[PDB]
Design a protein around this nucleic acid. Structure first.
Ligand SMILES: [Mg+2]
Ligand SMILES: [Mg+2]
Ligand SMILES: [Mg+2]
Ligand SMILES: [Mg+2]
Ligand SMILES: [Mg+2]
Ligand SMILES: [Mg+2]
Ligand SMILES: [Mg+2]
Ligand SMILES: [Mg+2]
Ligand SMILES: [Mg+2]
Ligand SMILES: [Mg+2]
Ligand SMILES: [Mg+2]
Ligand SMILES: [Mg+2]
Ligand SMILES: [Mg+2]
Ligand SMILES: [Mg+2]
Ligand SMILES: [Mg+2]
Ligand SMILES: [Mg+2]
Ligand SMILES: [Mg+2]
Ligand SMILES: [Mg+2]
Ligand SMILES: [Mg+2]
Ligand SMILES: [Mg+2]
Ligand SMILES: [Mg+2]
Ligand SMILES: [Mg+2]
Ligand SMILES: [Mg+2]
Ligand SMILES: [Mg+2]
Ligand SMILES: [Mg+2]
Ligand SMILES: [Mg+2]
Ligand SMILES: [Mg+2]
Ligand SMILES: [Mg+2]
Ligand SMILES: [Mg+2]
Ligand SMILES: [Mg+2]
Ligand SMILES: [Mg+2]
Ligand SMILES: [Mg+2]
Ligand SMILES: [Mg+2]
Ligand SMILES: [Mg+2]
Ligand SMILES: [Mg+2]
Ligand SMILES: [Mg+2]
Ligand SMILES: [Mg+2]
Ligand SMILES: [Mg+2]
Ligand SMILES: [Mg+2]
Ligand SMILES: [Mg+2]
Ligand SMILES: [Mg+2]
Ligand SMILES: [Mg+2]
Ligand SMILES: [Mg+2]
Ligand SMILES: [Mg+2]
Ligand SMILES: [Mg+2]
Ligand SMILES: [Mg+2]
Ligand SMILES: [Mg+2]
Ligand SMILES: [Mg+2]
Ligand SMILES: [Mg+2]
Ligand SMILES: [Mg+2]
Ligand SMILES: [Mg+2]
Ligand SMILES: [Mg+2]
Ligand SMILES: [Mg+2]
Ligand SMILES: [Mg+2]
Ligand SMILES: [Mg+2]
Ligand SMILES: [Mg+2]
Ligand SMILES: [Mg+2]
Ligand SMILES: [Mg+2]
Ligand SMILES: [Mg+2]
Ligand SMILES: [Mg+2]
Ligand SMILES: [Mg+2]
Lengths: 263, 158, 134
RNA sequence: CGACUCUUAGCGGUGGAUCACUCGGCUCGUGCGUCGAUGAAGAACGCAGCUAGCUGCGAGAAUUAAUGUGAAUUGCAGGACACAUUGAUCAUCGACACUUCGAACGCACUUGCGGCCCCGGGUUCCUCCCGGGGCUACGCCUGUCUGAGCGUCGCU
RNA sequence: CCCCGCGGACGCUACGCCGCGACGAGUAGGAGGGCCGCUGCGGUGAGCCUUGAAGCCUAGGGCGCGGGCCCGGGUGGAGCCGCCGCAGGUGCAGAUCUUGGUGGUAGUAGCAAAUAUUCAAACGAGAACUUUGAAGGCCGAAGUGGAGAAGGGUUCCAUGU
RNA sequence: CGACCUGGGUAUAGGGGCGAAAGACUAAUCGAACCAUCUAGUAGCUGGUUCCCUCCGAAGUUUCCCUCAGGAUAGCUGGC
RNA sequence: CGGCGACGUCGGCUACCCACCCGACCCGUCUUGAAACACGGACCAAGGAGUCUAACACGUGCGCGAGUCGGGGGCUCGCACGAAAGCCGCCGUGGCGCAAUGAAGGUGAAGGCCGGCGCGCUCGCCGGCCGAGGUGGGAUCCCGAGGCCUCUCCAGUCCGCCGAGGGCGCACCACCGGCCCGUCUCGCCCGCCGCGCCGGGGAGGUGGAGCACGAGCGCACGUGUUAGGACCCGAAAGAUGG
RNA sequence: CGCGACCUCAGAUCAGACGUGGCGACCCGCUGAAUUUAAGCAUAUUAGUCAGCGGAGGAGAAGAAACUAACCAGGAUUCCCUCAGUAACGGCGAGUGAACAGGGAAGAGCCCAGCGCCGAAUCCCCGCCCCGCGGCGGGGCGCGGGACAUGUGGCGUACGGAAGACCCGCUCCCCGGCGCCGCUCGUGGGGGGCCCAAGUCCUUCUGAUCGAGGCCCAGCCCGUGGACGGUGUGAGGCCGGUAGCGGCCCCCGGCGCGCCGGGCCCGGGUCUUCCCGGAGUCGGGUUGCUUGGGAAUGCAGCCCAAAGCGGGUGGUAAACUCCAUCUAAGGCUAAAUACCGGCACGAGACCGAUAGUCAACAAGUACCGUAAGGGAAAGUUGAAAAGAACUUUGAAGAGAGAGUUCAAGAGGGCGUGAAACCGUUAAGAGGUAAACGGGUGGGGUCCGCGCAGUCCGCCCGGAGGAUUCAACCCGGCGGCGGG
């Protein structure tokens, strides 16, 4: 807020022997404003309580290792059909979830052939969902230039831009993303992993250089290896039903002993 | 009033600091402006190094850093003298000069003068008149082999 | 979408510019699509409206194939008045109904020196664009 | 039986809350970063066919010219305008013009009063009046002219 | 070694479900949960809506211990919300609180300083207050008279409402 | 009929003016005017301090303080 | 098991009015004590008060870990989003931590067992090993006599469970020692290019926010304290210029 | 006993210029508090801050060491990170508090006086002629005047310089014009102007549609354009715009080339001989302010007042002694940097009319005070005025009909229209002021598809229907197991 708000007034308190509250009142006379309250958060025209100020520390710095960790987790999550379908990305007739196409799509120039590519990859229902979800935002965002809202479509990832950005970018929901400059704000849209992604082949090959394997370290980063698991075998049901566990247990106590009436 | 254990603190906020607060919201815009000016200057001086003139090899002053070597302000007058360069021509050919620096050790003196000879051997000199070259350099040497250099000229390595 | 950093997309700014637009660009704002036959005869799609050309209303209460000549281009109200597109008021007399020019199609153009030149420039630019596209 | 009063509902008043709308702000960022004696900022007074304010403008007065655009402006009237023997409107604005105070400048102002130099009229060119035009502030630089000094001298 | 029968209920959002025992006051104060509520952002609902959004009204039906919520009816005419996270100028009975509006008081106090009015008529829809005339009275020349200064700035003067 | 009343023109300005003297007067303000700012001055003092349920749950006592309407400290409390 | 069921009745009360019985003083606030002859409150609508920043402390969540952190700069079509995001690594400068102690000059954290020698003189030269000592508890883990089985035994075969006792002992606790720095008391040796007003070393008390095989760094959230207008409103006053 | 020269002064409406005042967010030079904190208060702190005065520019100030250091040395200034809440200061209390080094951003250096040398080589003004006008320039001429030896210009400045010899290298500058480019370079450089894709396709809702369905062919059409706004709802295709190393026109600017014209003048190395510096200034004493600077960091007043192998600094006052460092008392200089005022723009997890600027509106307006100054309230008919014709009572206000509109139960302070309060109608009640909790009862308004009350799995029987079951054959697909 303006630091001058509520204070461009020479108001001073009336005192205490005049049967009115001790809030400062504007001096002068001959107008509605004279004698009215001022300088208070409770007074009409006075400044707010604790005027918000520009030095509020809007920005947060996140550890680089944590940021790369989040990127790795989002990349892993996009490869699970349960998670991507949980985001509602209409991946039903997609031939294979880590969808990779040849580099010929990097040379696309026209939205016509981009759309035809999507249709042959059976991803067009995602764009159809975006189209059916376009609507008007609820609330003051309409006044604040965020008038229209929509859903997120699939994310196209490219290695070299040879006009593919221009070929796309008129498809609602499509986010074009360079493989060496990946963004968590686009991979996990609202803080929830599992966004549908379409990879160019060169971008798919570059992933072992960008983030490395576990046998090797990442080469295109100065020092980064993939994070280690704290639990290799996560199949809890299979583990519990393994014979090694089953031999060490005691028998289940599956008889319910309720309260017995005292006759 | 203090309450239980805790550091005795002396905040320096008794002096109306609110009127003088430096906010850094124009930091990325400042970075972009600096980058654009860098690109414009490098574009202006096409074959010359973008970073600037060659700086000398210099040892750090105090006992904390004297094991380390950084770049200096300019080559000394004695270094120029024994390198055979006129002190009014070195700056035009792109050598920083620091007249107010005197040498105290022949080891550092030799390091700097060998650096100067190496730079002179690495230099490509366009003729003043493009049609008529007097003593500058060869046509095959400068027709394509002269290109802009990024980063420091012959960087200082510990 | 829009990429020019010097072109605003603010709703309030755009509305301010629209309602405070000077007359010479209010004319450009009050532009109407040509009929199919005119869009074929001339390689142009729309055309700013004029005093004495004949249109037909395509939306609202007065739709119809009737060809009515404009009699007024009320630029302050952003409307035009058409010959038989009128309405009778209570006292007996009649007035015209304001109609936004975007809700009509021009069927005949009031040709003079200037309109032909405007058509020429628009058709030339369209040819340039399509020949670049091919 | 009513009157009065209380409670609840329907409706009608008073009131302008709520909700929606927003040519307004606030905050940040960018690019320039430009007043004035060749008369600034500010003020005053005036200017529209019908106009008090707001806006615009300066006696050429809600504007002249020029250039771009190309049929209006509009609340009513009136009136041009073959739109090419050249053009309504709007915009741009480089030509022209820009009343009185105001650093404010002949003197002074809560009033008014001069002086010099040309031109025109009564005069019938000589000097009185009337009108028009141009000067008439302070400090300061360089030069010019006029000078002052029992200042220091030289000739006589 | 099952089988004339090929069959055999529910479950376990494991942050879930189920069982048993004991206990329940509470200011100042502390903590937990909130599928309590408000506003805006990132996702999400192939969400809702001009065959009717928000809002408001209701002797309509209900749910929850409660915060509150859902639905019906009416008005209204253009936007609104659920779920997962995010961020707050986020919850009012008080503050002789601020702003705005409204009551009782109350058709009450009051329209009581300087003697005073009355008759007829005119206009006019309308006369105790206008106008004309006739009476009766006051200021009584240090005036309730005639003019000015300062101040006011058109109040001056006709005509019309 | 006078140390008389009074208009107008001037002069004196705030810790100053002016006072036949009452701390009177200085634009309804005077034991120090008014205006704007420093200023959201400070307050151990007065008043207020906004949704629900669940659980736990006090102290007005020690010691020190220009300390006695307040603090620190121990004690009492809750949470992890 | 019975009765009753459509223009008349059946059931419904949160919700509307009325009646009756019992109970029932007006809320907020200061207070030992408020219904108070204590103060604020005529009514209604809207606004209205622990906020942000900085610095600590502790708890918790996350990443990496004797390291950690790019926050400033730079590099990447400059800019819809992007003022974002990504990268640097001979940009780790630097900050914090990995060392403490004394005013300072300065100094600066390894012991234990087994041997031959001097005098195993409360000790100097080594060797061999091991590598922070010892006591008492100490979750957990390990060994374990002895048992628990079938239609039965004369004879061992595979594994399960219970188990008196025994052992290794995590973290942590209490103590005893040991090492580092300061400072006292005592006493004797050693070194040598500078034989010195030189330097080094030991024993016994005692001071230290120490060592004794690291736990930190960064980010986030919560609570508490303080600086700031600082939960909101409030002086009598002071100063500057008019 | 006049006339000249010089000096020092004066006048002029003399010829030609310049200053003034404004803005003041940022900057520079001064002057300068108190509130406040210290739980009091006087040093301290607030604070060299507010207020006051002066002076600028697009940046200003600073700035090329009388420096930092003590190193194996660095090297103008300014800004960022860090040093560092540290050294230090402080009723050593509250509190205050830098600098060096290191890493970055940017990087650029220089000119006088003096010492000298060069026949004052120097400069201004006035005339005449020519080429240019664009910020008045050049060329030539003047026994034209003036400034100036009390010192103009050239060389030359601490980084040494100059003058002679010996040797070596001729190596090529600037300014203003003519024409032409690549034209300028993240894709013209800038400014201005005019243009550039595709549904108003079929059926339907509506007052209006921008809504809802549909458009076979891989899918109505464009998409380098699905930002935004307007249009009678909610529009990629109706319109303006949007994208585009899209088009065209005009104007403006620096870059190279060939020509022309003008100015323009020798550089380096070695040896010899010379020559070298800023004074009421430094420094000291004292005083007062200031600083982190503490036996005194800086500034200033006053008194004293220098030196030349000197002077200053070397963070504890002094003497002696060595070493290190720089060269004060003259001046210029871009970039990195700042910007709550101005012009023109873009954006937002901000506010949505008691909010957000005081000001969404004829707002610094109305109005108040003599004045300095104080300073409001105040948005919304409707898509379209289609703004209620006409009849009728009243004098009119105002009614009653009628009419417009989807709506006047939108009718000119006209979106919706809450509460408090009031009028009317209906129901109920009333002598312990109202109101409240618990428990019922009566009435009333609504709710229940209330009004003959269920259902559904197997079995029994009746009356009927049937792309008909099982078992096999063919084919497809799964699930499990196989050394
Ligand atoms: Mg406000
Ligand atoms: Mg809402
Ligand atoms: Mg650089
Ligand atoms: Mg009502
Ligand atoms: Mg004109
Ligand atoms: Mg006078
Ligand atoms: Mg004489
Ligand atoms: Mg109990
Ligand atoms: Mg309880
Ligand atoms: Mg609030
Ligand atoms: Mg309230
Ligand atoms: Mg409220
Ligand atoms: Mg309360
Ligand atoms: Mg009465
Ligand atoms: Mg009376
Ligand atoms: Mg009488
Ligand atoms: Mg009388
Ligand atoms: Mg009179
Ligand atoms: Mg009159
Ligand atoms: Mg007295
Ligand atoms: Mg008075
Ligand atoms: Mg306060
Ligand atoms: Mg106050
Ligand atoms: Mg004491
Ligand atoms: Mg009390
Ligand atoms: Mg109590
Ligand atoms: Mg009491
Ligand atoms: Mg009470
Ligand atoms: Mg009592
Ligand atoms: Mg009392
Ligand atoms: Mg009280
Ligand atoms: Mg009261
Ligand atoms: Mg009240
Ligand atoms: Mg970034
Ligand atoms: Mg380091
Ligand atoms: Mg530190
Ligand atoms: Mg132990
Ligand atoms: Mg110990
Ligand atoms: Mg604490
Ligand atoms: Mg003159
Ligand atoms: Mg105090
Ligand atoms: Mg106090
Ligand atoms: Mg005090
Ligand atoms: Mg003080
Ligand atoms: Mg000031
Ligand atoms: Mg000035
Ligand atoms: Mg400067
Ligand atoms: Mg300077
Ligand atoms: Mg200070
Ligand atoms: Mg000279
Ligand atoms: Mg120098
Ligand atoms: Mg629209
Ligand atoms: Mg649209
Ligand atoms: Mg179009
Ligand atoms: Mg374009
Ligand atoms: Mg409102
Ligand atoms: Mg307002
Ligand atoms: Mg009336
Ligand atoms: Mg309606
Ligand atoms: Mg209304
Ligand atoms: Mg009623």
């Amino acid at each position: 807020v303006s630091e001058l708000a509520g204070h461009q007034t020479s108001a001073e308190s009336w005192g205490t022997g005049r049967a009115v509250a001790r809030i400062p009142r504007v001096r002068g006379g001959g107008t509605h404003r004279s004698g009215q309250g001022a300088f208070g958060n409770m007074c009409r025209g006075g400044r707010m309580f604790a005027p918000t100020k520009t030095w509020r520390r809007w920005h947060r710095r996140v550890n680089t290792t944590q940021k790369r960790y989040a990127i790795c987790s989002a990349l892993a999550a996009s490869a699970l059909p349960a998670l991507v379908m949980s985001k509602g990305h209409r991946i039903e007739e997609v031939p294979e979830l880590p969808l990779v196409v040849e580099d010929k799509v990097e040379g696309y120039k026209k939205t016509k052939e981009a759309v035809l590519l999507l249709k042959k990859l059976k991803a067009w229902n995602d764009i159809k969902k975006v189209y059916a979800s376009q609507r008007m935002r609820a609330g003051k965002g309409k006044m604040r230039n965020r008038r229209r809202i929509q859903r997120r479509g699939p994310c196209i990832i490219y290695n070299e831009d040879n006009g593919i950005i221009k070929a796309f970018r008129n498809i609602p929901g499509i986010t074009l993303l360079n493989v060496s400059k990946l963004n968590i704000l686009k991979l996990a849209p609202g803080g929830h992993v599992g966004r549908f992604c379409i990879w160019t082949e060169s971008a798919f090959r570059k992933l072992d250089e960008l983030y490395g394997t576990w046998r090797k370290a990442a080469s295109l980063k100065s020092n980064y290896n993939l994070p280690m698991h704290k639990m290799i075998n996560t199949d809890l049901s299979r583990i519990l039903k393994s014979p090694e566990i089953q031999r060490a247990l005691r028998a289940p106590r599956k008889k319910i002993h309720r309260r017995v009436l005292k006759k | 009033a203090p309450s239980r254990n805790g550091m005795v603190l002396k905040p320096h906020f008794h002096k109306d600091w609110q009127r003088r607060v430096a906010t850094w919201f124009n930091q990325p815009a400042r970075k972009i402006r600096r980058r654009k000016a860098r690109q414009a200057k490098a574009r202006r001086i096409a074959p010359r190094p973008a970073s600037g003139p060659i700086r000398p090899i210099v040892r750090c002053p105090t006992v904390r850093y004297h094991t380390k070597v950084r770049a200096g302000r300019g080559f000394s007058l004695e270094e120029l003298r024994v390198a055979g360069i006129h002190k009014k021509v070195a700056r035009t050919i792109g050598i920083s000069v620091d007249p107010r620096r005197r040498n105290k050790s022949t080891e550092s003196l030799q390091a700097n003068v060998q650096r100067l000879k190496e730079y002179r051997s690495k230099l490509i000199l366009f003729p003043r008149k493009p049609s008529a070259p007097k003593k500058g350099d060869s046509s095959a040497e400068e027709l394509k082999l002269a290109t802009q250099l990024t980063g420091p000229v012959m960087p200082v390595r510990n | 979408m829009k990429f020019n950093p010097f072109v605003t997309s603010d709703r309030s700014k755009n509305r301010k510019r629209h309602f405070n637009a000077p007359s010479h660009i209010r004319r450009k704002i009050m532009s109407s699509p040509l009929s199919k036959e005119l869009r074929q005869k001339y390689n142009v799609r729309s055309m700013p409206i004029r005093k004495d050309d004949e249109v037909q209303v395509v939306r609202g209460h007065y739709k119809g194939q009737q060809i009515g000549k404009v009699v007024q281009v009320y630029r302050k109200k952003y409307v035009i008045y058409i010959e038989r597109v009128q309405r009778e008021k209570a006292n007996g007399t009649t007035v015209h109904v304001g109609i936004h020019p975007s809700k009509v199609v021009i069927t005949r153009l009031k040709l003079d020196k200037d309109r032909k030149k405007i058509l020429e420039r628009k058709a030339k630019s369209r040819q340039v664009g399509k020949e670049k596209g091919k």
